[PDB]
Design a protein around this ligand. Structure first.
Ligand SMILES: OC[C@H]1O[C@@H](O[C@H]2[C@H](O[C@H]3[C@H](O[C@@H]4[C@@H](O)[C@H](O)[C@@H](CO)O[C@@H]4O)O[C@H](CO)[C@@H](O)[C@@H]3O)O[C@H](CO)[C@@H](O)[C@@H]2O)[C@H](O)[C@@H](O)[C@@H]1O
Ligand code: MG
Length: 387
């Protein structure tokens, strides 16, 4: 009797609230499950293996190609063309790219995100930076200077389990990641030099080489143990809600540049699980949640980025300092490679990064290994497409 919705993290709390109003408005009962992002990919895999799971699923954009490849998401092309709230034409092209495969559409953008630099304005001033670092050389320099405040003080965080980080920096140094032929180029100089660059922060003590176990207010607030980092909109919301002691002492900025300062485009879509016996009510739910006023309500409350383009004309999105930075960054933000093995490739990058930063492996050598692993994965997939 109940429409099952799987959602993730902090956003799923807003979705649960909205779903309560949906149930009041339509009479359709809805149970929203809240799944940590850390566990979600495994939970999705289990649902696919068992063909049992939710009716509506919040899908991280980077996993769209995987779960379309697996046949787990319903083709909703005809249905979204005929909604006035879910039509692809309303959304940013980069967001739409995460939903469309071989001419068919498999979800509706729910929110977008991109990654920006968060920095303590007061602490950067004290090391001679009146504005955020704007190049790789400046990020390195400021970070190293901030790390000299003390043995347990740092300058910049590199999250070893953040799928986007290595690949963002790689593209900034001109690596396409995969060349025109689909061949991975992780062992070519642009990428190798990127990973050397990131390792430089570990080697010089300016990025922590273990998880310090601090929440954002404890690491970025107070005396600013970690005084620069990269994140998305959800960290503006977190810091506004949890770090009052640094109100007026931090800001965001666009990413520092190397060749370019491109960031990632991510977020989440709403999709219908292929095996659902509630497809009609799933679509009603998605249409309702795509109402522009329903969207803007929760988006602005959480400082989140709409994937719907006309939302950006809203006075807050044009004039709020955080939204100005996100909007600027979004102009050039690109999805991670939209390939069905992305997550597994990212996890492989993670292992290789750990061999380097913790194991002391030579970067070129480890990138040769990693690139071979990736090529092997791609061949393994190709073979499934050639029976
Ligand atoms: O990778 C799948 C999917 O990720 C989306 O990013 C979402 C982000 O998830 C990242 C995670 O963030 C956590 C946060 O969820 C958690 O509440 C706090 C406190 O525990 O810690 C982090 O900040 O970070 C890990 C790396 O450590 C990363 O793997 C996750 O992707 O969570 C945000 C808060 O819910 C979401 O706003 C954000 O969308 C991408 O947007 C999407 O493209 C990816 O497919
Ligand atoms: Mg130090």
């Amino acid at each position: 009797k109940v429409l099952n919705v799987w959602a993730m993290g902090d956003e799923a709390k807003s979705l649960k609230e909205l779903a309560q109003k949906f149930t009041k408005d339509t009479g359709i009962e809805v149970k929203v499950q809240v799944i940590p992002w850390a566990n979600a990919h495994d939970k999705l895999l289990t649902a696919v293996a068992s063909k049992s799971g939710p009716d509506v699923v919040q899908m991280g954009t980077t996993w769209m190609p995987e779960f379309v490849e697996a046949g787990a998401l319903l083709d909703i092309t005809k249905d979204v063309e005929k909604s006035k709230n879910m039509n692809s034409d309303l959304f940013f092209p980069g967001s739409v790219k995460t939903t469309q495969f071989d001419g068919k559409t498999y979800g509706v953008p729910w929110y977008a995100e991109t990654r920006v630099l968060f920095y303590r304005t007061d602490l950067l001033k004290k090391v001679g930076y009146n504005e955020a670092p704007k190049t790789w050389d400046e990020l390195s320099d400021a970070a190293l200077k901030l790390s000299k405040r003390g043995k347990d003080m740092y300058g910049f965080a590199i999250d070893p389990n953040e799928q986007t980080t290595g690949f963002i920096f790689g593209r900034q140094n001109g690596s396409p990641l995969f060349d025109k032929d689909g061949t991975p180029v992780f062992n070519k100089k642009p990428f190798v030099d990127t990973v050397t660059y990131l390792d430089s922060f570990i080697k010089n003590g300016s990025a922590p080489d273990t998880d310090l176990g601090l929440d954002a207010s404890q690491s970025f607030g107070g005396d600013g143990i970690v005084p620069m980092f990269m994140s998305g909109p959800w960290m503006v919301n977190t810091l506004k809600d949890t770090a009052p002691d640094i109100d007026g002492k931090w800001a965001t900025a666009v990413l520092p540049k190397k060749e370019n300062n491109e960031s990632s485009l991510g977020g989440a879509n709403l999709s219908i699980f292929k095996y659902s016996n509630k497809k009609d009510d799933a679509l009603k739910f998605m249409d309702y949640m795509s109402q522009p006023d329903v969207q803007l309500s929760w988006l602005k409350d959480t400082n989140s980025m709409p994937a719907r383009m006309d939302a950006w004309e809203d006075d807050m999105l044009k004039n709020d300092p955080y939204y100005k930075v996100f909007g600027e960054q979004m102009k050039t933000a690109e999805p991670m490679p939209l390939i069905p093995q992305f997550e597994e490739i990212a996890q492989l990058y993670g292992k290789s990064w750990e061999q380097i930063y913790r194991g002391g492996a030579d970067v070129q050598t480890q990138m040769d290994t990693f690139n071979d692993q990736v090529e092997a994965l791609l061949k393994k997939l190709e073979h499934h497409h050639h029976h």
